[PDB]
């Protein structure tokens, strides 16, 4: 309702860098909020694409940002009569970024890995990797839970069980309040998908440069399955955390599997041991239900609610015709040990090919009335197709069907305005939470400030 669309601040990255593909707020130890921006096609120092990360200090005028340095050199280690190899070219560093406490976690989902042994190999595959940085000290660490040293022949002899070679760990990411990093790895277990969890403290304390294969003893990975419903489900395409079992001591995971069960799609709510607590099935095949997931209490009752995006949902129209517009589903958490039922509300896009529900961001309480709010992106929405972000305010009944406010893209066609979104943080210290919108196609990020 009260985001100011006139006085925008633009931050920009290099041409072709996809600056704005991902973003987050980052608060230093002093309390000063900056903006972390991922740029997965940034050219490294040898003119090869590696991706990169930028840390933008808050300024009304915006502009250019300093690049948060990471090691972009390939590594080789001859140990145990094997040869371990990392490959950082086209790794997509900054395809996701997330901040927790004084730490930034930037992932490279397409970082490749091989292990050679005489004439045999593991196979050169995208295991992915996450880079961790503590800016105020310079500390660096890495985490790459899917790297292995098993040869190709052994997977074949075991019918490809526990095959983590194509994980793309870091494809999605989230951090719990206690400092547990949770990574989505949609290529896990031969494209079923997996989650990898480890405490940030233990990632830092167990990492040393050049080792490449090491143990994080506190880590916890989800499980493989022979159930064909899960095949090619991309479980981990998106991920979030919340409180859904009424026990504040435990933390629950929300996982999107957009192609689960022959492209029906699904979202699952899990406990921290990865036991399924509830499954929400997609409505329409190929709609990509589970592309985006968001967790926030929108009806003021203190219990987290779930929002799921299906950005290729096709709406029925006159004379038996279908129109790809996208859809968002709201699930309100009921009282007691009861299950999440059917959706309390369905928001459907209006522009053909707009991809409404491609991103969903909790805003906190944008208007300070007591109910939390959300923003939904339609990256190719609006009459011209340049992109649109729609603000929905929470209320006792859940969300309002009519958006309180529409943000039209200020960038040209192809910008993907809204493809990434973050809110719930007051960047300028005015008492109202603000919104940051990435437009990777235009290599820029727009900041909208909430006003009284």
């Amino acid at each position, epitope marked *: 309702l009260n985001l100011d669309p006139v006085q925008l601040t633009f931050y920009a990255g290099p041409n072709g860098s996809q600056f704005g593909f991902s973003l987050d707020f980052h608060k230093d130890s002093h309390g000063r909020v900056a903006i972390v921006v991922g740029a997965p096609r940034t050219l490294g120092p040898s003119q090869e694409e590696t991706g990169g990360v930028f840390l933008c200090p808050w300024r009304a005028e915006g502009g250019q940002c300093p690049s948060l340095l990471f090691d972009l050199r390939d590594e080789t*280690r*001859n*140990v145990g*009569s094997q040869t371990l190899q990392t490959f950082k070219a086209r790794q997509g560093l900054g395809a996701s970024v997330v901040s927790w406490s004084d730490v930034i976690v930037a992932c490279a989902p397409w970082q490749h890995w091989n292990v050679l042994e005489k004439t045999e190999e593991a196979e050169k595959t995208p295991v992915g990797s996450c880079f961790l940085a503590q800016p105020e000290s310079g500390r660096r660490a890495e985490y790459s839970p899917c790297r292995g040293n098993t040869l190709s022949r052994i997977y074949v002899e075991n019918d490809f069980s526990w095959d983590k070679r194509y994980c793309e760990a870091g494809f999605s990411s989230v951090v719990t309040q206690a400092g547990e990093l949770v990574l989505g790895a949609p290529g896990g277990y031969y494209f079923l998908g997996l989650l990898a969890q480890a405490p940030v403290a233990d990632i830092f304390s167990s990492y*040393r440069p050049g080792i490449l294969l*090491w*143990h994080v*003893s506190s880590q916890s990975l989800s499980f493989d399955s022979s159930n064909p419903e899960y095949f090619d489900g991309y479980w981990g395409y998106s991920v979030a955390v919340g409180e859904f079992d009424g026990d504040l001591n435990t933390t629950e995971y929300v996982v999107g599997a957009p192609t689960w069960s022959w492209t029906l799609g699904a979202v699952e709510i899990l406990d921290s041991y990865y036991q399924r607590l509830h499954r929400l099935r997609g409505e329409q095949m190929a709609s990509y239900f589970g592309h985006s997931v968001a967790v926030t209490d929108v009806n003021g009752d203190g219990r987290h609610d779930l929002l799921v995006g299906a950005p290729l949902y096709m709406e029925s129209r006159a004379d038996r015709k279908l129109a790809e517009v996208g859809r968002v589903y709201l699930f309100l958490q009921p009282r007691g040990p009861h299950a999440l039922g059917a959706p309390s509300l369905l928001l459907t896009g209006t522009q053909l090919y707009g991809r409404f529900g491609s991103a969903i961001a909790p805003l906190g309480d944008l208007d300070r009335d007591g109910y939390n709010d959300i923003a939904v992106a339609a990256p190719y929405g609006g009459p011209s197709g340049r992109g649109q972000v729609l603000v929905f305010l929470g209320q006792s009944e859940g969300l309002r069907s009519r958006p309180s406010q529409v943000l039209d893209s200020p960038f040209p066609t192809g910008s993907a305005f809204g493809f990434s979104l973050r809110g719930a943080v007051d960047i300028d210290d005015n008492g109202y939470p603000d919104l940051i919108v990435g437009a990777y196609g235009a290599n820029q990020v727009a900041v909208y400030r909430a006003q009284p």
Partner: antibody
Amino acid sequence: EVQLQQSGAELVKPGASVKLSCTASGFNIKDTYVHWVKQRPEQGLEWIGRIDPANGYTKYDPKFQGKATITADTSSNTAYLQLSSLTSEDTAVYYCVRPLYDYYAMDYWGQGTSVTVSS
Amino acid sequence: DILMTQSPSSMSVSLGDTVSITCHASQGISSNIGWLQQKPGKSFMGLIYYGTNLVDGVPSRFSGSGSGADYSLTISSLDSEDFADYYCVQYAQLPYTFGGGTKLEIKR
């Protein structure tokens, strides 16, 4: 606290077999490679082999192939070393070992198990 | 197999000394070396992994160095607890192999 707890001193006859054990305390045995190492006063330290208890796969030094068999049981969090065809050269102290962080390192050791072969 | 030659096999030293134990590999092992300590009558404790990294809890007076085929363990300012046996181990190649050991003994 990571601790490898090995079984007690063994007094065994030549030509017989013995099976030594190493039980994980404060961690799970499948977390890492587990190695077995031999120590004798004059000949020093010799690596016997290793097991990945997650899947049972083993490697051996050729000198011990066909004498030493390493196994593991994740149910009881225990790794085992079996020595067949005991001879006077097998009188030694035997250690189980695992790495701290580096997959390939040899950082944590059990207290050792003394085997004495005699008639 | 990689032969690990450790030197010296013993040294007579005093409290507060700084001393080095060397290990020479029969080929390059690119820092895939560990250093181990055995106190009299006791088992083993790991000191260093991958050339220079201290095992958790190991005092900072222990340090590792070297490259290629030649490595060193240095103990700065010897403590009474440091009179013990020390061994290198390589894990560049299977089979892993150990040096012959160095005994630190008390000078008098």
